[PDB]
């Protein structure tokens, strides 16, 4: 029974990706409801209108989780369900729905771990400039407090933000996510700052509520490596790590932003409009985080600009062989995080494989996914023996869901959803395997 009992095995979803019922029970419009209906933005013009219909089928879905012997379900609350316009009047039917989702998980002894913001911002607040406006950060702490008050007698594991890197990076640098802005780097760093503000402030609010759960943020964890032993390439990697780890992980865990990158934003005219009050709140609540969430998929191997580019030129990523796999990459990454942040408590809050799942006689035999998960689970076992403080694993995607960009195409998850048969669910091969892995508590030889 090798993983300890205070380690949770789980699976994850996000609201807009699974829920559907986009205009039901008083849900406000959100940024993604609008953005996905701009032609050419999303694969086949796919819609979060219905998604996988999880709103209406939640009792069913949680049953399947129960039958999986899932210990924890990580899901996201839709802000537009609780507070439709972002602030103002609370919507009692949003609270009714999430109370039911929570109570159902709980019937079966499944631990809700709630993500407050997984990219689905109510529209008014997007048009305010979203994360580039302090307003949106202040609206979020008010929203968070509403969820704590409503759900925190039962919910005792809370995530504020999923993957700030992406919703700021994709919306202001690459323009792939709303609001669709391209190479506006000062807005990007602004966005990240007001988010880190909203977080640390929300954490303060939570501790004041005396609910005695745990709270933390969940970042992309994209550990970066020099393509070889060359100094100029190792320099590129340090740079990579400064911008892609330290900028994200330092403000929340350490309470200070990292001076390397701060120096460079000043020297470029890219420093966000930040104030002492804000930076102090961030400073004062860094020690108040109970854990860090990691969304790990791959490392990145890098070489320098002269030697896929990074938003400041300087380095590029390169595919080669010493999308990427690398259990070795993930593990060294973990130690890299322990050296800097200490014995911080870690939840691998996403990890899994997107695929065109192989189908045989109507069965889904997703052995790539099993092999992906097994490999990472294996090195987490090593990591724990090597001292890392990992206390949970959340395979990205409990149930097939709507990709933001790629519609339905690259399945994620354990429960298959049948688009040809009224979105009927079916256990995949990974479902049966993971159930066994939970019951064995990860005894797959170590």
Numbering used by the authors: 1 to 307, 325 to 339, 347 to 470
Sentences from the paper on this structure:
In summary, we have characterized a novel PvGal-ase encoded by ORF1119 in Bacillus strain HMA207. The overall structure of ORF1119 was similar to those of other GH1 enzymes, which have a typical (β/α)8 barrel fold. The active site is located at the bottom of the pocket formed by loops of the barrel, a characteristic of most GH1 enzymes. The catalytic nucleophile (E374) and the catalytic acid/base (E163) residues of ORF1119 were conserved with other GH1 enzymes.
Structures of the ligand-free form and PvGal-bound form were determined at 2.5 Å and 2.45 Å resolution, respectively. The crystals belonged to space group P3221 and contained two protein molecules in the asymmetric unit. Because the structures of all four chains (chains A and B in both the ligand-free and complex forms) were almost the same (root mean square deviation for Cα atoms, <0.6 Å), below we describe chain A of the PvGal-bound form.
